């Protein structure tokens, strides 16, 4: 019964693809000791993930020039130490157009106009549209307060990150690896000043949505700025692309 | 493959339906192949809902047909004619007797907004209503809201030391103000009337031996209110 | 009648024939433009009220090449002959004298077409022999002399009508 | 009368009041009539504890502050033309410099007056009709006419020191843009859609930058002109078009950093690190300046025909065409109070030179809000 | 008004109402189903029926519009000779008033602009399709049109004789000779030519035209 889960412009949102997504995320959580969240809203989260995948796929797949595959074989061989191989290529082609389009929007001045440690931190996104259609910000603030409080109280992290986030890293708990104070968006200098490893960090106001940050751990300048820039402009671009779209639930 | 047949083919040619999808008969059937051919069903876009269902008996496919337009109506178009709107939708590939593209609805509305951009109704809103009909058809209600159109605030000729401004404005076609006791015209700016008015003004000066007189320029300005128009 | 004839005016038939102007000796006639020039064609055309001004019946495999009614790509073409027999037993309720099935050759009897327009009953017999031309099992009808009002009239226009009755019905159901 | 022939347009309803603290009208002093249903930028001036205002008729009022006392008034109407009673037709916003005031008219004549006595300094002919408020700097004054000609007049006596030609498309909006000065350079935005920085004292243009979207879905409308006043701070220039591109760049002919798809004609305010503005369609947005990323947005009211917002004692204040005036919290965009202060309506930009707020009613008189 | 019904029964009632002879509701339902389904296989036959219907009811301008539309959409339809013939027939029959034929006055000198166009259409038919069902009738009608045009030309020349503008009558009879040297009108009008040449004493050609007349006296 692989029916269509949603109507998304031209293509469709199917059931086998969400099945594959659930299988992959749950097996990875089993391997990586990440708590397996209850499939009450996990179904809808995976469905939303696939829907945004399809919309970002329609914007760009029809354009550009696909990608080669031998480099994919080499990369997966390195990462090792025909159903599976299909999803391996799609995440590269979807990121290729994503990596390209965000660069086109943002322009870069020479770094010398900007004059001149690594930390592990997680991120959670509350999807707020261009304007609160149902005044979501009103409830958004209440949910943000509740969830940051629960994070303080000592709840597990995979469940909270999975619960109702929106970004692509959210599946794996939303950890962004090691970052320094100057690869993070220009709104978290005060947040990193007023933070510590493992304590509470208040939610932050933003156009895209509030963000929950948990301190999980503790030539260059071009990438120093590029990381955080890329962050904010890619987030804004994906939000705007999602908003200007036609998606209908089917069930 | 033993048996293949499609539902809801009231107007659909079976030959096209079988030829579009890859598998026909006599090939292996598994989940990835059936999913791929389901994707290939929407390849033309001529469908709205096609799906595969789990059965131990042969094969069966559910299909829902795209509605085709039966008629179009334009209720709410006080100051314009229905037939021109019909021609406009004719040009935009929305000819009556075609599949109703629900995706394009916003573009259709916006195109009609640009159509009222010409007349002078700028704060207008058009809404679409979709009514299904038997035989799986569709009728369209086009609701038009022509709110308020542009109005000339004042005509301002500048630079003159022979004739007062009113003595000059009195002999144009477009008006900035009308007597309160009389109703014979409105301040409905038209792009064509500007050139005629400039010709009139040029004649008015030049007929009394102001030979060197010429226009420095003309200026039409819109207030960011879509109700006031200024002319200099 | 006002159904199958030109407008009531008929005074053009008695048109005086054209007498070409001879050229006297010593001089010739001027050049002709040829914009109003009358050619010569074959006769045997219905004139006056006799001409049948009625739109032609376009068949609706729909062979329309005169008597040629050989409709042919469906692999179940054999069962179309009993399917045509359904049209005979039911529908028109007509019958066939020598209706071969293995040879797929049916000799349907002469029918009686009468659909308004003061039309005398038309008796048309067809050769319903089903070929296999350029496709799977085809079916063909080959008409013959048709009685109608007269003993037999086989005008070009009426032949298109007589074939059409079967062409409409046979395509209509089968 | 013709409003009956047309069906009423759609307007967003008013939000909740919850007036936490209620200021009032400090004084309802009267300044002639109002500008009515004419679009003009004629805000009054605050100068050394007195106020200066005018009206389209030509009346100009100098009034005492802190009370509705009228120090003096002058009828600046035309008294020497074809009838010696012609309408003055004043539109240029008031300007103060030293003991002198500069006023602009939609009649190509700019008037300088002397303060404290009502005496007329002089009058000067300027190309095109003046609509932008004069800007005074370096013993000079600059005016942007709605003809495409930036013009400079000598401060001391009035003289055409230089002009700069600008490009004008066909159906541009009002050419109401006031250039601003920084380090001997005047920066402005024309109706072409391109901003320009120009060296003073000779008219030598320094650089020009294109700030506009694509050609739009069509050519009709989709106007790309810029009229909001560019803002220079920390050597950084901010400009904003009609369909709009938030263009921030470096003063030393420096190039753009970021662009965003927001347009407006109402001026924005830059304070500390925050940008505060109300755009076209009348939604209020607050952003940053390190990257210009959006901080928050509010669209509870929509198409309510606001004014240019103004900061005041910690929170923003915005007018309305209806006469409502709203207080916006600096954080979250929460309301503080809704003041039905006047029924005529608010059109012209406010002034907050001191801790005292003064605002002009479009069809009425000025009002002081505490 | 008319419900959206399958093309089957709407065409069936079209056929049977047309066979009945009632034409108002016939054209009504034809135009209705023509507007509704401008894609069905009926379209060719629908329009071929509608042209006949417009002709029979004398809605001739609309018949000409529809016939131009039909010619435009398929210029090489297998049975276009019929529609061309109908074009000529409508165009000719549009030149009748049905009252001057009551009283017997012949309309041979009224506005001959429809006659010319009908002639062009019939000539085009006979040129292209000399082996179709509409040959002899076309030839007879075309002879009639040629004689009518000749009659009009002779009428104008005769009036200019009464007025006494002999250059004009000379030119008109010369045009007769070049364009219709086959009808009775030119044979009758040659004496007007000889009279004209004798009037300006350009008689040197008067005897030439005199031989022209005399040679075919019998």
From Swiss-Prot, chain A:
GO cellular component: outer membrane-bounded periplasmic space
Reactions catalysed according to its record: [protein]-peptidylproline (omega=180) = [protein]-peptidylproline (omega=0)
BP-aspect Gene Ontology terms: chaperone-mediated protein folding; Gram-negative-bacterium-type cell outer membrane assembly; maintenance of stationary phase; maintenance of unfolded protein; protein folding; protein stabilization
PROSITE patterns for the chain: PPIC_PPIASE_1 (PS01096), PPIC_PPIASE_2 (PS50198)
Cell compartments where the protein resides: Periplasm
Coiled coil region boundaries: none
Catalytic class of the enzyme: isomerase
Single Gene Ontology MF annotation: peptidyl-prolyl cis-trans isomerase activity
Keywords: Chaperone, Isomerase, Periplasm, Repeat, Rotamase, Signal
Gene3D superfamilies registered for this protein in UniProt: 3.10.50.40, Porin chaperone SurA, peptide-binding domain
Annotated PpiC domain residues: 117-217
EC id: 5.2.1.8
UniProt cross-references to InterPro entries, sorted A to Z: OMP_Chaperone_SurA, PPIase_dom_sf, PPIase_PpiC, PPIase_PpiC_CS, PPIase_SurA, SurA_N, Trigger_fact/SurA_dom_sf
UniProt remark on domains: The PPIase activity resides only in the second parvulin domain. The N-terminal region and the C-terminal tail are necessary and sufficient for the chaperone activity of SurA. The PPIase activity is dispensable for SurA function as a SurA protein with a deletion of the parvulin domains is almost completely functional in vivo. The N-terminal region and the C-terminal tail are also required for porin recognition.
Protein name: Chaperone SurA
Native organism: Escherichia coli (strain K12)
Protein encoded by which gene: surA
Swiss-Prot record, chain B:
Domain note: Contains 5 N-terminal periplasmic polypeptide transport-associated (POTRA) domains which interact with other subunits of the complex, may recruit substrates from the periplasm into the outer membrane and also act as a chaperone. The C-terminal region forms a discontinuous 16-stranded beta-barrel transmembrane region. The central pore is ellipsoid, and probably closed by extracellular loop 6, perhaps with the aid of other loops.
The keyword Signal is annotated on this UniProt entry: yes
Residues annotated as domain POTRA: 1-66, 67-147, 150-232
Tree of life domain: Bacteria
Gene Ontology biological process terms, A to Z: cell adhesion; Gram-negative-bacterium-type cell outer membrane assembly; protein insertion into membrane
Subcellular location field: Cell outer membrane
Protein name: Outer membrane protein assembly factor BamA
Parent-protein residues present: 26 to 257 of 810
GO cellular component assignments: Bam protein complex; cell outer membrane; membrane
Record keywords, A-Z: Cell adhesion, Cell outer membrane, Membrane, Repeat, Signal, Transmembrane, Transmembrane beta strand
Disruption phenotype: Deletion is lethal. Depletion results in the accumulation of incorrectly assembled outer membrane proteins, including TolC, OmpF, OmpC and OmpA. Decreased expression leads to decreased susceptibility to contact-dependent growth inhibition (CDI), and decreased expression of outer membrane proteins (including in this study LamB) as well as up-regulation of periplasmic protease DegP.
Effect of residue 156 to A: Lethal, protein does not accumulate
Family listed: Belongs to the BamA family.
Swiss-Prot record, chain D:
Tagged with keyword Signal: yes
Gene Ontology cellular-component annotations: Bam protein complex; cell outer membrane; membrane
Subcellular location: Cell outer membrane
Coiled coil regions in record: none
UniProtKB keywords: Cell outer membrane, Lipoprotein, Membrane, Palmitate, Signal
PANTHER family: CELL SURFACE PROTEIN (PTHR34512), OUTER MEMBRANE PROTEIN ASSEMBLY FACTOR BAMB (PTHR34512:SF30)
NCBIfam families registered for this protein in UniProt: assembly_YfgL, PRK11138.1
Family to which this protein belongs: Belongs to the BamB family.
Subunit comment: Part of the Bam complex, which is composed of the outer membrane protein BamA, and four lipoproteins BamB, BamC, BamD and BamE. Monomer. Interacts directly with BamA. The Bam complex has the shape of a hat, with the BamA beta-barrel crown in the outer membrane and the periplasmic brim formed by the BamA POTRA domains and the 4 lipoproteins.
Protein name: Outer membrane protein assembly factor BamB
Organism (species): Escherichia coli (strain K12)
Swiss-Prot record, chain E:
GO biological process: Gram-negative-bacterium-type cell outer membrane assembly; protein insertion into membrane
Domain of life: Bacteria
Lipoprotein keyword on record: yes
GO cellular component: Bam protein complex; cell outer membrane; membrane
Keyword annotations: Cell outer membrane, Lipoprotein, Membrane, Palmitate, Signal
Membrane topology, from the record: Lipid-anchor
Alphabetical list of InterPro entries matching this protein: BamD (IPR017689), BamD-like (IPR039565), TPR-like_helical_dom_sf (IPR011990)
Mutant lacking the gene: phenotype: Depletion decreases the density of outer membrane proteins, but does not significantly affect transport of lipopolysaccharides to the outer membrane.
Pfam families, per the entry: YfiO
Location of the protein in the cell: Cell outer membrane
Keyword Lipoprotein: yes
Subunit-structure text: Part of the Bam complex, which is composed of the outer membrane protein BamA, and four lipoproteins BamB, BamC, BamD and BamE. Forms a subcomplex with BamC and BamE. Interacts directly with BamA. The Bam complex has the shape of a hat, with the BamA beta-barrel crown in the outer membrane and the periplasmic brim formed by the BamA POTRA domains and the 4 lipoproteins.
Protein purpose: Part of the outer membrane protein assembly complex (Bam), which is involved in assembly and insertion of beta-barrel proteins into the outer membrane. Constitutes, with BamA, the core component of the assembly machinery. Probably involved in transient protein interactions. Efficient substrate folding and insertion into the outer membrane requires all 5 subunits.
Stated family: Belongs to the BamD family.
Gene, per the UniProt record: bamD
């Amino acid at each position: 019964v692989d029916c269509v889960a949603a109507v998304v412009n031209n293509g469709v949102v199917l059931e086998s693809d969400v099945d594959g997504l659930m299988q992959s995320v749950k097996l990875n959580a089993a391997q990586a000791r990440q708590q397996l969240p209850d499939d009450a809203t996990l179904r809808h989260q995976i469905m939303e993930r696939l829907i945004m995948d399809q919309i970002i796929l329609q914007m760009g797949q029809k354009m550009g020039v696909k990608i080669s595959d031998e480099q994919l074989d080499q990369a997966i061989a390195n990462i090792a130490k025909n159903t599976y191989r299909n999803q391996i290529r799609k995440e590269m082609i979807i990121s290729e157009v994503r990596n390209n389009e965000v660069r086109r929007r943002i322009t870069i001045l020479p770094q010398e106009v900007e004059s001149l440690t690594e930390l592990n931190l997680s991120h959670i996104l509350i999807p707020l549209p261009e304007n609160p259609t149902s005044d979501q910000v009103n409830e958004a603030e209440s949910q943000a307060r509740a969830i940051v409080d629960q994070a303080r109280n000592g709840a597990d992290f995979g469940k909270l990150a999975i619960a109702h986030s929106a970004d692509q890293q959210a599946l794996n708990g939303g950890q962004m690896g090691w970052g320094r104070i100057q690869e993070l968006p220009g709104i978290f200098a005060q947040a990193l000043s007023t933070a510590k490893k493992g304590d509470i960090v208040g939610p932050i106001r933003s156009g895209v949505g509030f963000h929950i940050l948990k301190v999980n751990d503790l030539d260059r300048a071009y990438r120093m700025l590029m990381n955080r820039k890329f962050s904010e402009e890619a987030a804004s671009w994906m939000q705007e692309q999602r908003a200007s779209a036609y998606v209908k639930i089917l069930s | 493959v033993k048996d293949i047949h499609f539902e809801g083919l009231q107007r659909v040619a079976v030959g096209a339906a079988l030829l579009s999808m890859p598998v026909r008969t006599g090939d292996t059937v598994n989940d990835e192949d059936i999913s791929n051919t389901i994707r290939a069903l929407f390849a033309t876009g001529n469908f709205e809902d096609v799906r595969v269902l789990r059965d131990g008996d042969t094969l069966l496919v559910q299909v829902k047909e795209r509605p085709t337009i039966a008629s179009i109506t334009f209720s709410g178009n006080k100051s314009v004619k229905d037939d021109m709107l019909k021609q406009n939708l004719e040009a935009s590939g929305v000819r009556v007797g075609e599949s109703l593209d629900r995706t394009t609805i916003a573009d259709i509305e916006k195109g009609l907004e640009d159509f009222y951009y010409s007349v002078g109704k700028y704060s207008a809103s058009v809404k679409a209503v979709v009514t299904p009909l038997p035989r799986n058809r569709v009728d369209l209600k086009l609701v038009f809201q022509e709110g308020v159109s542009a109005e000339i605030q004042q005509i301002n000729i500048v630079g003159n030391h022979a004739f007062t401004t009113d003595e000059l404005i009195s002999h144009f076609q477009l008006r900035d103000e009308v007597p309160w006791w009389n109703v014979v015209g409105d301040r409905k700016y038209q792009k064509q009337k500007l050139a005629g008015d400039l010709e009139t003004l040029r004649s008015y000066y030049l007929d009394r031996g102001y030979a060197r007189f010429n226009i420095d320029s003309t200026q039409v300005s819109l207030t960011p209110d879509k109700k006031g128009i200024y002319v200099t | 009648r006002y159904s199958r004839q030109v407008s009531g005016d008929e005074a053009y038939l008695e048109a005086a024939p054209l007498a070409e102007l001879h050229a006297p000796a010593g001089m010739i006639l001027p050049v002709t433009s040829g914009d109003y020039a009358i050619p010569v064609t074959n006769g045997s055309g219905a004139v006056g009220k006799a001409l049948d001004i009625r739109p032609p019946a376009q068949p609706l495999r729909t062979q329309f090449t005169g008597d040629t009614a050989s409709l042919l790509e469906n692999g179940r073409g054999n069962t179309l002959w009993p399917q045509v027999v359904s049209v005979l037993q039911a529908k028109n309720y007509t019958i066939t004298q020598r209706d071969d099935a293995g040879q797929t050759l049916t000799t349907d009897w002469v029918q009686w077409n009468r659909l308004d327009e003061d039309e005398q009953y038309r008796g048309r017999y067809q050769i319903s022999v089903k070929p296999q031309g350029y496709q799977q099992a085809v079916t063909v009808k080959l008409l013959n002399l048709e009685q109608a009002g007269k003993p037999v009239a086989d005008a070009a226009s009426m032949q298109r009508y007589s074939t059409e009755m079967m062409n409409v019905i046979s395509a209509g159901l089968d | 009368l013709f409003n009956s022939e047309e069906d009423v347009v759609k307007m967003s309803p008013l939000p909740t009041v919850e007036n936490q603290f209620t200021p009032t009208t400090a004084w309802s002093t009267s300044v002639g009539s109002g500008i009515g249903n004419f679009y003009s930028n004629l805000h009054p001036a605050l100068a050394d504890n007195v106020v200066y205002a005018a009206d389209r008729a030509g009346l100009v009022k100098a009034l005492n502050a802190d009370d509705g006392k009228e120090i003096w008034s002058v009828s600046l109407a035309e008294k020497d033309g074809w009838f010696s009673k012609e309408p003055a037709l004043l539109s240029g916003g008031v300007t103060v410099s030293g003991g002198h005031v500069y006023i602009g008219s939609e009649k190509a004549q700019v008037y300088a007056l002397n303060t404290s006595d009502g005496t007329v300094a002089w009058q000067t002919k300027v190309a095109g009709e003046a609509l932008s408020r004069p800007v005074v700097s370096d013993g000079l004054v600059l005016i942007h006419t709605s003809n495409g000609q930036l013009q400079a007049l000598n401060e001391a006596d009035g003289a055409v020191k230089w002009t700069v030609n600008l490009d004008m498309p066909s159906l541009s909006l009002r050419g109401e843009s006031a250039p601003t000065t920084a380090f001997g350079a005047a920066v402005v935005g024309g109706d072409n859609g391109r901003v320009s920085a120009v060296l003073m004292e000779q008219g030598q243009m320094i650089w020009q930058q294109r700030i506009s979207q694509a050609t739009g879905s069509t050519e009709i409308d989709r106007l790309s002109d810029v009229d909001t006043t560019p803002v220079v701070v920390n050597g950084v220039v901010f400009a904003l078009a009609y369909n709009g591109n938030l263009t921030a760049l470096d003063l030393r002919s420096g190039q753009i950093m970021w662009k965003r798809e927001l347009g407006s004609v109402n001026d924005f305010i830059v304070d500390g690190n925050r940008i505060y503005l109300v755009d076209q369609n009348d939604r209020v947005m607050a952003l940053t300046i390190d990257g210009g990323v959006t901080l928050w947005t509010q669209s509870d009211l929509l198409h309510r025909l606001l004014t240019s917002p103004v900061l005041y004692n910690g929170n923003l204040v915005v007018g309305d065409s209806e006469g409502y005036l709203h207080w916006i919290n600096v954080e979250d965009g929460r309301f503080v109070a809704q003041q039905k202060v006047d029924s005529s309506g608010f059109q012209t930009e406010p002034v907050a030179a001191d801790g005292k707020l003064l605002i002009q009613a479009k069809d009425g008189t000025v009002y002081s809000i505490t | 008004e008319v419900p959206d019904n399958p093309p089957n029964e709407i065409y069936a009632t079209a056929q049977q109402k047309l066979q009945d002879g009632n034409w108002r509701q016939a054209i009504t339902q034809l135009e209705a189903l023509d507007n509704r389904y401008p894609f069905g296989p009926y379209s060719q036959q629908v329009q071929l029926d509608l042209i006949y219907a417009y002709y029979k009811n004398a809605d001739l301008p609309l018949a000409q519009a529809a016939i131009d539309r039909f010619i435009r959409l398929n210029p090489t339809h297998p049975n276009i000779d019929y529609v061309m013939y109908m074009r000529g027939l409508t165009n000719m029959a549009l030149d009748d008033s049905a009252l001057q034929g009551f009283f017997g006055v012949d309309r041979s000198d009224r506005d001959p602009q429809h006659a010319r166009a009908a002639f062009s259409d019939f000539s085009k038919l006979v040129r292209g399709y000399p082996n179709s069902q509409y040959t002899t009738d076309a030839t007879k009608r075309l002879v009639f049109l040629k004689d009518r045009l000749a009659k009009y030309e002779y009428s104008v020349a005769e009036y200019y004789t009464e007025r006494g503008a002999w250059v004009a009558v000379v030119n008109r009879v010369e045009g007769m000779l070049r364009d219709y040297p086959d009808t009775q009108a030119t044979r009758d009008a040659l004496p007007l030519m000889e009279n004209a040449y004798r009037q300006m004493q350009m008689n040197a050609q008067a005897e030439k035209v005199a031989k022209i007349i005399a040679a075919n006296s019998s």
